[PDB]
Amino acid sequence: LTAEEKAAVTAFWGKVKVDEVGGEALGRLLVVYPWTQRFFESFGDLSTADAVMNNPKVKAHGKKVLDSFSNGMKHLDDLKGTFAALSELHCDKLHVDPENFKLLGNVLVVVLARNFGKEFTPVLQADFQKVVAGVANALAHRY
Amino acid sequence: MLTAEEKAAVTAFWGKVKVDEVGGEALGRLLVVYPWTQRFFESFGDLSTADAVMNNPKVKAHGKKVLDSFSNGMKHLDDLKGTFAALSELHCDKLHVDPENFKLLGNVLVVVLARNFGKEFTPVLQADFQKVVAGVANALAHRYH
Amino acid sequence: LSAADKGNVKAAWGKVGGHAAEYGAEALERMFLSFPTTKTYFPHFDLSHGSAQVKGHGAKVAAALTKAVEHLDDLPGALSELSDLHAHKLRVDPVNFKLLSHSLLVTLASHLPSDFTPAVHASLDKFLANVSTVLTS
Amino acid sequence: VLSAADKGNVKAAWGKVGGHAAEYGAEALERMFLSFPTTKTYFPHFDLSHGSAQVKGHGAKVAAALTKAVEHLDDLPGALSELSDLHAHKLRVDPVNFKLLSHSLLVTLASHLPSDFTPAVHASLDKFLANVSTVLTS
Numbered sequence: 001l002t003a004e005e006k007a008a009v010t011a012f013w014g015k016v017k018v019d020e021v022g023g024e025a026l027g028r029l030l031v032v033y034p035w036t037q038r039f040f041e042s043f044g045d046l047s048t049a050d051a052v053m054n055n056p057k058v059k060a061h062g063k064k065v066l067d068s069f070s071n072g073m074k075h076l077d078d079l080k081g082t083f084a085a086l087s088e089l090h091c092d093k094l095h096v097d098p099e100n101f102k103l104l105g106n107v108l109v110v111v112l113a114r115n116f117g118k119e120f121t122p123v124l125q126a127d128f129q130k131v132v133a134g135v136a137n138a139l140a141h142r143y
Numbered sequence: 144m145l146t147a148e149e150k151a152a153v154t155a156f157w158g159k160v161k162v163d164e165v166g167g168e169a170l171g172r173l174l175v176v177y178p179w180t181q182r183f184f185e186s187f188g189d190l191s192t193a194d195a196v197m198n199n200p201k202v203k204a205h206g207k208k209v210l211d212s213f214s215n216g217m218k219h220l221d222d223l224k225g226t227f228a229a230l231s232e233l234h235c236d237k238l239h240v241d242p243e244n245f246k247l248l249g250n251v252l253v254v255v256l257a258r259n260f261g262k263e264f265t266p267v268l269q270a271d272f273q274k275v276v277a278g279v280a281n282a283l284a285h286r287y288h
Numbered sequence: 289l290s291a292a293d294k295g296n297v298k299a300a301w302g303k304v305g306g307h308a309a310e311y312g313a314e315a316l317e318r319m320f321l322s323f324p325t326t327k328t329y330f331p332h333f334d335l336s337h338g339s340a341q342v343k344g345h346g347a348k349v350a351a352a353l354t355k356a357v358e359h360l361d362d363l364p365g366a367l368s369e370l371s372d373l374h375a376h377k378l379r380v381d382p383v384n385f386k387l388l389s390h391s392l393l394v395t396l397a398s399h400l401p402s403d404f405t406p407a408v409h410a411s412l413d414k415f416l417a418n419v420s421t422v423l424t425s
Numbered sequence: 426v427l428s429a430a431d432k433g434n435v436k437a438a439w440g441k442v443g444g445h446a447a448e449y450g451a452e453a454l455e456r457m458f459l460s461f462p463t464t465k466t467y468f469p470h471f472d473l474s475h476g477s478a479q480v481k482g483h484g485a486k487v488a489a490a491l492t493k494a495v496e497h498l499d500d501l502p503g504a505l506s507e508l509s510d511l512h513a514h515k516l517r518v519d520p521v522n523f524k525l526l527s528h529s530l531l532v533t534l535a536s537h538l539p540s541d542f543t544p545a546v547h548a549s550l551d552k553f554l555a556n557v558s559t560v561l562t563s
């Protein structure tokens with residue numbers, strides 16, 4: 001990202017309720033791309049969209065996922081370093097296919113769009129696309 | 144990537160490869176199997192049929208050059224990023240080829256090696272070549288990141 | 289698409305109502321800004337915000353999606369001319385359909401936040417993937 | 426959804442496979458597991474080393490399913506309904522892994538059928554395996 005784009009995403013991120021947004025994003029991933037539920041057997045009831053969205057473990061996990069995005073947002077020129085440990089975990093221990101990192105990033109962007117309306121402009125969304133591409137790339141690096 | 148011993152084994156196999164034959168075949172199969180890739184080759188003349196594609200002299204000549212770049216990569220397996228930096232600029236900044244296609248051509252090359260080498264292209268050797276073509280595709284895509 | 293997915297798609301497209309052309313243009317703009325590789329398909333356009341060409345093209349895209357929504361049981365037939373154009377003439381890379389589809393979901397979520405439930409999102413995703421499959425066959 | 430031309434090429438190529446289909450299925454799995462280790466995590470109950478009888482036997486099952494598909498190209502959703510449920514609902518197989526097995530199958534077929542694996546046949550087989558994959562992930 002350029003300095004201007006970094007400033008724009010930094011400013012926007014300050015407005016984001018990460019607990020709410022993260023839970024929505026993770027829940028939507030599990031609903032829209034149901035094979036991803038393979039990785040969350042221990043989370044209990046994922047039987048329906050409503051069960052997924054209201055599942056306390058989904059909401060709690062989603063918050064933690066978005067906390068890692070918050071860390072990335074402070075290190076946009078060193079996402080590789082920032083996500084190195086999580087790359088090891090997701091790639092070497094969990095064996096998540098890296099395509100799914102792109103899918104979760106894109107779901108997050110849809111969620112931001114849903115939650116922010118006209119504030120989530122084409123330009124701001126394009127900046128966030130650069131962010132989520134960077135995060136997905138960093139997470140895939142151990143492949 | 145690869146250990147020195149593993150590099151010796153892939154180098155030995157690669158020594159057998161006829162780049163004119165294999166390169167032309169790989170590029171032609173990309174254009175036949177994944178026909179959207181023809182978007183980038185309008186200047187190559189007749190791509191109207193599978194036979195036209197495979198027998199097109201420009202496709203064969205270009206494929207040889209593609210395989211020469213794989214041969215260069217095979218000599219610099221610990222610095223694919225640097226080796227493919229100029230080609231990354233060409234494919235990403237100038238042509239805007241979607242990087243998914245770099246993976247597709249690498250996998251076509253693996254299929255072509257299998258077709259041409261049969262029994263000799265073992266599962267073990269193929270797996271090391273999968274690492275090589277992934278590395279080449281990643282290096283070529285670097286200008287998008 | 290399943291009958292439930294078809295229900296969600298028709299209901300969502302109903303909520304879009306008279307805004308479909310506007311949302312088509314916005315989706316294109318979001319695609320071009322987010323995914324600059326896609327701009328090389330439209331070197332003949334002015335791609336600046338609010339351009340007449342993007343507005344007009346967005347209306348065409350929306351009209352094709354409306355046609356799809358009205359012919360969910362026969363997309364191959366209904367979109368035959370558009371499939372030939374995209375796959376044979378234009379040689380559009382299949383990846384780019386994913387990028388436009390995502391751009392359309394972002395647009396719909398932006399404008400229909402109450403209606404864009406997780407289930408509706410899933411159904412619209414499958415719809416756009418089905419349209420994309422037809423246009424790349 | 427295959428074209429007539431693709432159906433013809435698939436039936437002809439699979440005919441040439443003949444009584445080696447199980448062998449090729451087993452080799453394709455072996456190549457998938459070696460080249461794409463993420464796929465191994467779907468088979469915790471298997472020994473995945475070269476020559477495993479479990480990989481051999483599973484290859485025969487996969488071959489039987491592909492043969493059934495070749496014999497029912499006009500109704501893959503129907504013919505593969507049990508396998509679709511198993512892979513999509515029970516096993517939750519990531520769609521990407523179907524690409525990885527499909528590639529592994531093409532490598533295997535190219536190795537064994539070098540005269541028959543023409544560019545056109547390669548293209549048809551690619552579309553066949555993509556169509557099977559779509560059905561099994563629906």
Ligand code: HEM
Nearest residue numbers: 036039040042064065068069086094096100101104105135
């Ligand atoms: C942008 C992409 C992603 C980010 C930033 C991310 C981040 C995280 C973080 C930060 C954790 C650790 C939470 C903690 O502190 O305990 C985690 C755990 C995990 N992630 Fe992800 N993740 C991503 C994508 C995915 C995807 C796509 C999947 C699977 C489809 C996945 C599956 C998991 C699993 C299974 C765990 C461990 C859950 C458990 O402990 O039971 N992640 N992820």
Ligand code: HEM
Nearest residue numbers: 180183184208209212213230238240244245248249279280
């Ligand atoms: C691993 C993947 C690839 C490698 C190693 C590779 C390599 C090369 C090389 C070495 C050249 C320059 C040849 C010369 O000396 O003139 C080249 C040019 C080119 N490549 Fe690739 N390439 C790859 C993938 C692709 C793909 C997927 C496409 C399109 C779908 C593509 C399209 C082109 C085009 C359009 C040119 C220029 C042709 C011209 O001169 O008009 N390449 N590539």
Ligand code: HEM
Nearest residue numbers: 326329330348349352353370373378380384385388419420
């Ligand atoms: C849901 C997916 C899509 C739909 C419904 C769609 C619809 C349309 C329609 C209705 C037209 C006009 C046809 C005509 O004038 O007869 C068109 C033209 C075109 N589309 Fe698409 N399209 C889609 C995806 C794409 C993608 C992904 C690209 C490239 C990134 C693309 C590039 C083009 C181009 C280059 C034209 C011709 C432009 C021109 O006439 O000036 N389309 N599309």
Ligand code: HEM
Nearest residue numbers: 464467468486487490491508512516518522523526557558
């Ligand atoms: C062309 C694609 C595929 C075909 C035709 C196919 C076919 C089969 C068949 C026939 C069975 C046995 C079902 C039974 O015993 O009732 C099966 C089981 C299975 N498949 Fe696949 N499969 C395909 C792709 C995949 C992929 C991509 C994966 C994962 C990477 C996978 C993982 C499994 C697993 C884990 C089982 C169960 C194993 C067991 O019970 O021992 N399959 N498949």
